[PDB]
Amino acid sequence: VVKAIARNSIGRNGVGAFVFPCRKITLQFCNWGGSSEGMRKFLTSKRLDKWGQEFPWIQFEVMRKSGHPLLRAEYTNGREKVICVRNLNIDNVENKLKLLKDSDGDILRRRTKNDNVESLNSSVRGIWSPLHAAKRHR
């Protein structure tokens, strides 16, 4: 007899199509507040428009709130990076935005030495066996 034990498929973002990881970016600023001056300038300066033109798969919200200025960004996986751009200037804000866009939403994490690849595919060659070795031990 053969019985099936249930399972589900794992998504590999880039193998078929590629969904773009960043989805929404919210430029948050304040009219009053010297910390939010750079942000304001950025908003003014057609740079935002240019960015929009470049990257239409990602939407730019523009909120008005009383605190420090922010760039909260929302990703496919669900997670949300948030960068407070306190007291930055236009270029720095732009750089921050770029950084946000580039990243996948995934959490930061310490890598060990040489941990490069991350597969969910069973080894093409088998896992070594002492009995199926080409050279026996002694």
Partner 1 sequence: QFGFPKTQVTTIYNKTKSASNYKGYLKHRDAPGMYYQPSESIATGSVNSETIPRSFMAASDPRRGLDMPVQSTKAKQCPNVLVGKSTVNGKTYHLGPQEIDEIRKLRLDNPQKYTRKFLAAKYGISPLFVSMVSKPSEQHVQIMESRLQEIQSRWKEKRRIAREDRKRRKLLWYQA
Partner 2 sequence: SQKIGHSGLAFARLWHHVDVARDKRTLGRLASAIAITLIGRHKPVYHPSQDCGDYVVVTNCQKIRVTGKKFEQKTYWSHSGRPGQLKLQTMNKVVADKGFGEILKKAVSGMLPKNKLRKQRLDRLKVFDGSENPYKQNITAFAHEQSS
Partner 3 sequence: TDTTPLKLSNELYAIFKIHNRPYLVTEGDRVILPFKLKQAEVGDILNMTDVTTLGSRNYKLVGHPINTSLYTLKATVVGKTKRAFQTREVTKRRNRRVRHAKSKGDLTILRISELSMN
Would you tell me which residues interact with partner 1 (CB under 8 A)? 122, 124-129, 131-135, 137
Rule CB under 8 A: say whether 111 interacts with partner 2. no
Report in angstroms how near the CB of residue 113 gets to RNA at its nearest.
4
Report in angstroms how near the CB of residue 118 gets to partner 1 at its nearest.
17
Taking the C-alpha atoms of residue 90 and residue 70, their distance in angstroms, rounded to an integer, is: 13
Task: Answer with the entry of partner 3, partner 1, RNA, none that 61 interacts with (C-beta below 5 to 8 A by kind).
Answer: none
Exposure string for 92-114, b = 16+ CB within 10 A, e = fewer: ebbebbeebbeeebeeeeeeeee
Task: Kindly report the number of other CB atoms within 10 A of residue 25's CB atom.
Answer: 21
Taking the C-alpha atoms of residue 25 and residue 118, their distance in angstroms, rounded to an integer, is: 29
Task: Answer with the entry of partner 3, partner 1, partner 2, none that 102 interacts with (C-beta below 5 to 8 A by kind).
Answer: partner 3
In 3D, which of 25, 52, 49, 29 has the Cα closest to residue 39?
Answer: 29
Which residue ranges make up the site for partner 2 (CB under 8 A)? Answer: 117, 119-132, 137-138
Which residue ranges make up the site for partner 3 (CB under 8 A)? Answer: 12-16, 18, 20-21, 101-104, 106, 108-111, 115-121, 124-126
